[PDB]
Design a protein around this motif. Structure first.
Motif, PDB file in Angstrom:
ATOM      1  N   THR A  58       0.825  -1.219   0.000  1.00 50.32           N
ATOM      2  CA  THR A  58       0.000   0.000   0.000  1.00 50.32           C
ATOM      3  C   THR A  58       0.858   1.268   0.000  1.00 50.32           C
ATOM      4  O   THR A  58       0.630   2.209  -0.762  1.00 50.32           O
ATOM      5  CB  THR A  58      -0.978  -0.008   1.191  1.00 50.32           C
ATOM      6  OG1 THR A  58      -1.791  -1.189   1.103  1.00 50.32           O
ATOM      7  CG2 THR A  58      -1.863   1.226   1.179  1.00 50.32           C
ATOM      8  N   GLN A  95       1.501   4.106  -3.175  1.00 52.82           N
ATOM      9  CA  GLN A  95       1.369   5.548  -2.982  1.00 52.82           C
ATOM     10  C   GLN A  95       2.597   6.344  -3.427  1.00 52.82           C
ATOM     11  O   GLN A  95       2.453   7.490  -3.828  1.00 52.82           O
ATOM     12  CB  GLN A  95       0.982   5.870  -1.534  1.00 52.82           C
ATOM     13  CG  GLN A  95      -0.428   5.430  -1.239  1.00 52.82           C
ATOM     14  CD  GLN A  95      -0.816   5.638   0.208  1.00 52.82           C
ATOM     15  OE1 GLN A  95      -0.290   6.535   0.893  1.00 52.82           O
ATOM     16  NE2 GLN A  95      -1.752   4.821   0.688  1.00 52.82           N
ATOM     17  N   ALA A 127      -6.096   8.682  -6.800  1.00 55.04           N
ATOM     18  CA  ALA A 127      -6.688   7.952  -5.700  1.00 55.04           C
ATOM     19  C   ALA A 127      -7.521   6.771  -6.157  1.00 55.04           C
ATOM     20  O   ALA A 127      -7.599   5.783  -5.466  1.00 55.04           O
ATOM     21  CB  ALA A 127      -7.552   8.910  -4.841  1.00 55.04           C
ATOM     22  N   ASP A 128      -8.153   6.874  -7.330  1.00 51.63           N
ATOM     23  CA  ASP A 128      -9.006   5.801  -7.817  1.00 51.63           C
ATOM     24  C   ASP A 128      -8.159   4.661  -8.371  1.00 51.63           C
ATOM     25  O   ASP A 128      -8.475   3.503  -8.152  1.00 51.63           O
ATOM     26  CB  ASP A 128     -10.032   6.382  -8.797  1.00 51.63           C
ATOM     27  CG  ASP A 128     -10.860   7.478  -8.138  1.00 51.63           C
ATOM     28  OD1 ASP A 128     -11.527   7.141  -7.131  1.00 51.63           O
ATOM     29  OD2 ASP A 128     -10.795   8.658  -8.577  1.00 51.63           O
ATOM     30  N   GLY A 164      -6.961   2.782  -5.495  1.00 51.41           N
ATOM     31  CA  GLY A 164      -8.034   1.850  -5.139  1.00 51.41           C
ATOM     32  C   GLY A 164      -7.988   0.570  -5.949  1.00 51.41           C
ATOM     33  O   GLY A 164      -8.123  -0.518  -5.396  1.00 51.41           O
ATOM     34  N   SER A 220      -5.061  -1.773  -4.948  1.00 49.59           N
ATOM     35  CA  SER A 220      -5.334  -2.488  -3.679  1.00 49.59           C
ATOM     36  C   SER A 220      -6.094  -3.786  -3.879  1.00 49.59           C
ATOM     37  O   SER A 220      -6.095  -4.635  -2.983  1.00 49.59           O
ATOM     38  CB  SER A 220      -6.142  -1.593  -2.710  1.00 49.59           C
ATOM     39  OG  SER A 220      -7.531  -1.614  -3.005  1.00 49.59           O
ATOM     40  N   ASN A 242      -9.157  -3.905  -3.821  1.00 45.27           N
ATOM     41  CA  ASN A 242     -10.414  -3.671  -3.098  1.00 45.27           C
ATOM     42  C   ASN A 242     -10.860  -2.208  -3.213  1.00 45.27           C
ATOM     43  O   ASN A 242     -10.935  -1.495  -2.212  1.00 45.27           O
ATOM     44  CB  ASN A 242     -10.223  -4.061  -1.634  1.00 45.27           C
ATOM     45  CG  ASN A 242     -11.535  -4.076  -0.837  1.00 45.27           C
ATOM     46  OD1 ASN A 242     -12.628  -4.319  -1.377  1.00 45.27           O
ATOM     47  ND2 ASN A 242     -11.430  -3.810   0.465  1.00 45.27           N
ATOM     48  N   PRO A 243     -11.177  -1.752  -4.439  1.00 45.01           N
ATOM     49  CA  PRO A 243     -11.596  -0.357  -4.588  1.00 45.01           C
ATOM     50  C   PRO A 243     -12.912  -0.073  -3.849  1.00 45.01           C
ATOM     51  O   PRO A 243     -13.769  -0.927  -3.765  1.00 45.01           O
ATOM     52  CB  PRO A 243     -11.795  -0.201  -6.102  1.00 45.01           C
ATOM     53  CG  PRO A 243     -11.914  -1.590  -6.653  1.00 45.01           C
ATOM     54  CD  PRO A 243     -11.100  -2.457  -5.728  1.00 45.01           C
ATOM     55  N   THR A 244     -13.037   1.133  -3.319  1.00 49.10           N
ATOM     56  CA  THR A 244     -14.312   1.548  -2.724  1.00 49.10           C
ATOM     57  C   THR A 244     -15.367   1.752  -3.820  1.00 49.10           C
ATOM     58  O   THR A 244     -15.050   1.785  -5.027  1.00 49.10           O
ATOM     59  CB  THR A 244     -14.133   2.866  -1.978  1.00 49.10           C
ATOM     60  OG1 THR A 244     -13.832   3.899  -2.916  1.00 49.10           O
ATOM     61  CG2 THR A 244     -12.995   2.804  -0.923  1.00 49.10           C
ATOM     62  N   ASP A 258     -16.896   4.468  -4.600  1.00 45.59           N
ATOM     63  CA  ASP A 258     -16.491   5.694  -5.298  1.00 45.59           C
ATOM     64  C   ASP A 258     -15.342   5.436  -6.280  1.00 45.59           C
ATOM     65  O   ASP A 258     -15.342   5.948  -7.398  1.00 45.59           O
ATOM     66  CB  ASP A 258     -16.087   6.784  -4.311  1.00 45.59           C
ATOM     67  CG  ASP A 258     -17.282   7.395  -3.592  1.00 45.59           C
ATOM     68  OD1 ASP A 258     -18.452   6.991  -3.861  1.00 45.59           O
ATOM     69  OD2 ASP A 258     -17.036   8.297  -2.749  1.00 45.59           O
ATOM     70  N   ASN A 259     -14.336   4.678  -5.846  1.00 52.70           N
ATOM     71  CA  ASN A 259     -13.264   4.286  -6.753  1.00 52.70           C
ATOM     72  C   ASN A 259     -13.774   3.548  -7.990  1.00 52.70           C
ATOM     73  O   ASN A 259     -13.324   3.812  -9.094  1.00 52.70           O
ATOM     74  CB  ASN A 259     -12.259   3.351  -6.058  1.00 52.70           C
ATOM     75  CG  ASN A 259     -11.448   4.008  -4.939  1.00 52.70           C
ATOM     76  OD1 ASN A 259     -11.222   5.240  -4.875  1.00 52.70           O
ATOM     77  ND2 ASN A 259     -10.959   3.151  -4.054  1.00 52.70           N
ATOM     78  N   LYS A 260     -14.713   2.618  -7.796  1.00 51.77           N
ATOM     79  CA  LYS A 260     -15.262   1.836  -8.893  1.00 51.77           C
ATOM     80  C   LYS A 260     -15.943   2.717  -9.921  1.00 51.77           C
ATOM     81  O   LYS A 260     -15.682   2.598 -11.113  1.00 51.77           O
ATOM     82  CB  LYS A 260     -16.213   0.758  -8.369  1.00 51.77           C
ATOM     83  CG  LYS A 260     -15.502  -0.306  -7.532  1.00 51.77           C
ATOM     84  CD  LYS A 260     -16.501  -1.172  -6.768  1.00 51.77           C
ATOM     85  CE  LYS A 260     -17.262  -2.097  -7.678  1.00 51.77           C
ATOM     86  NZ  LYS A 260     -18.133  -2.993  -6.855  1.00 51.77           N
TER      87      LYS A 260
END
Lengths: 112, 56, 56
Positions: free
Chosen positions: A25, A29, A35-36, A39, A42, A44-46, A48-50
């Protein structure tokens, strides 16, 4: 020697070629600012990321064809077969018209 | 000491754990060869990248 | 990422929702006898058959 040369622990784990998920992680960075995209990296995008990742590549969501409504374009089912009319009287002509109406009603082409 | 040990400035920024957007572009290029994936990692893929990413 | 595959609109079947083609034009009926009324009904039926709105 790497301990004497480098302060950052995530960098040090990379240089040892052994990284934990936390090290990964942090290293992501250092490599990527969006930020997306972070995501995505990771795994495991949130939510919002998706949404933003799809926008980023111009992708759509899985499309499901909705049934037609009186207000909204949609799919229909194809109507059952209907025989051409050979009616010579009103009663039969009306019978044949009604057969067409029911077929279109059955297929959800027209409303009940 | 890192200045004495490494020539590449983008690598050096990574080792300092402080990268600019330009450093990140260069480091992405060291890590990934597919041009459309590099477009995705930038956060700003071109029209062509977008088409190719969907295909991918 | 919650993406779908490229969607292709299938033709309607008797079991499965689908698209249709729009039927050809059909004139309103001015029939004053049974023969003509039946002729006009049949014109509608053929139009709907031609567009795959109803089965043969």
């Amino acid at each position: 020697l790497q301990d004497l040369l480098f302060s950052d622990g995530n960098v040090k784990a990379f240089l040892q070629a052994t990284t934990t998920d936390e090290n990964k992680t942090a290293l992501q960075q250092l490599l990527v600012s969006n930020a997306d995209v972070l995501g995505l990296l990771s795994g495991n995008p949130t939510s919002d990321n998706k949404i933003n990742l799809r926008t980023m590549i111009g992708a759509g969501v899985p499309y499901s064809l909705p049934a037609a409504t009186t207000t909204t374009l949609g799919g229909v089912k194809k109507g059952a077969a209907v025989t051409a009319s050979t009616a010579t009287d009103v009663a039969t002509a009306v019978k044949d018209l009604n057969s067409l109406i029911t077929v279109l009603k059955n297929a959800g082409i027209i409303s009940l």
